Amino acid sequence: IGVCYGMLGNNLPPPSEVVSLYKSNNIARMRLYDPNQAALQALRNSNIQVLLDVPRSDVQSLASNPSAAGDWIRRNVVAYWPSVSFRYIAVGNELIPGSDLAQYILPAMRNIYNALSSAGLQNQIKVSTAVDTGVLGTSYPPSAGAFSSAAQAYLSPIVQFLASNGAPLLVNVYPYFSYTGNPGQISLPYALFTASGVVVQDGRFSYQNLFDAIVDAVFAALERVGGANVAVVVSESGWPSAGGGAEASTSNAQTYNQNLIRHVGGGTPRRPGKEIEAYIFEMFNENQKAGGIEQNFGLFYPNKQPVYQISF
């Protein structure tokens, strides 16, 4: 399993202690939301595989300035390779289709890919972008999954690129928000992997949990735009332990995240052959996030005590 290393608290451990905590918990992968130099230094020789984001403030330059992608890769990747085990570069996070920066994603992806390819790294370090599930229009049943017209205009060209390079699409997936958004329709057990039997019978495909239903809606959408062979990496998934309603609790967050860990090895109903790569959001409670649930997605408190015990 992977874990997202969010840094927006005023009281978190230094990156070196955080890397030690990953290693001691046998957490194999890490997402960084920017090329923090202290984190990349700490990751040297750790063997932790890294999903590294291009920050939103860099995407336009990587698209438009012909020197920028090469400079970015040389500073943030080549300077740390091979001691840092890079696995993905995610060009943007939740930009499609509404952001004014969406127009720069594929150009930036192409320019980054070219730089990595020249160095012989285009295979181990795959280039993608991270989207939210708002890119879906229809999503029930999962086999009806299709991108919205607005999302499709950006994603069809991106998916052609991903398929050609053997790269996945990254998707932030939260059963939690489907649950809170649909009271009386989406059950708590369905969201927490503890539903009894099939909740949605979708032809040959049986959905026992909400995670599978959302992810497979994305697979179904990908199949319509030349993406049948494009894998999905779940680049965020988690459950808040406080700051919301009664079901934002340590008990439910433990159930969601532990069950996720026990689930992903079997894949999904549409793609059962391989483990789904997933990153738990997130390592620590971040006290500089918006008040409420966003301050409470941590597996660990700032002093490194687990918020709830997890076997990774």
Protein described:
The protein has 312 residues and is of the alpha/beta class. The chain has one domain (1-312): Glycosidases (TIM Barrel, Alpha-Beta Barrel), CATH 3.20.20. Helices cover 34% and strands 15% of the residues. The chain has ten helices and ten strands. The protein has helices at 15-24, 37-43, 56-64, 68-76, 105-118, 149-165, 175-181, 188-192, 210-223, 250-263; strands at 2-4, 29-32, 49-54, 85-93, 126-132, 169-172, 200-202, 205-207, 232-237, 278-280. The strands form two sheets. It has an eight-stranded parallel β-barrel with strand order 1-2-3-4-5-6-9-10, surrounded by four helices. It has a two-stranded antiparallel sheet with strand order 7-8. Helix 3 packs across helix 5 (105-118) and helix 4 (68-76) packs across helix 5 (105-118). It is globular. It is classed as hydrolase. The entry lists the keywords endo-beta-1, 3-glucanase, (beta-alpha)8-TIM-barrel, B-cell epitopes, allergen, banana, hydrolase. It forms a monomeric assembly.
Give a quick summary of the entry.
This protein is of the alpha/beta class and 312 residues long.
Q: What structural class do you assign from the helix and strand content? A: alpha/beta
The description of the largest β-sheet is: 8 strands, parallel, barrel
How much of the sequence lies in strands comes to 15-25%
Q: Helix count?
A: 10
Order of helices and strands: EHEHEHHEHEHEHHEEHEHE
Count of folded domains: 1
What Rg, in angstroms, do the CA atoms define? 19 Å
Would you count the extended β strands for me? Answer: 10
* CATH level-four homologous superfamily name: Glycosidases
InterPro entries: Glyco_hydro_17 (IPR000490), Glyco_hydro_17_plant (IPR044965), Glycoside_hydrolase_SF (IPR017853)
Organism: Musa acuminata (Banana)
Keywords: Allergen, Glycosidase, Hydrolase, Signal
Pfam families: Glyco_hydro_17
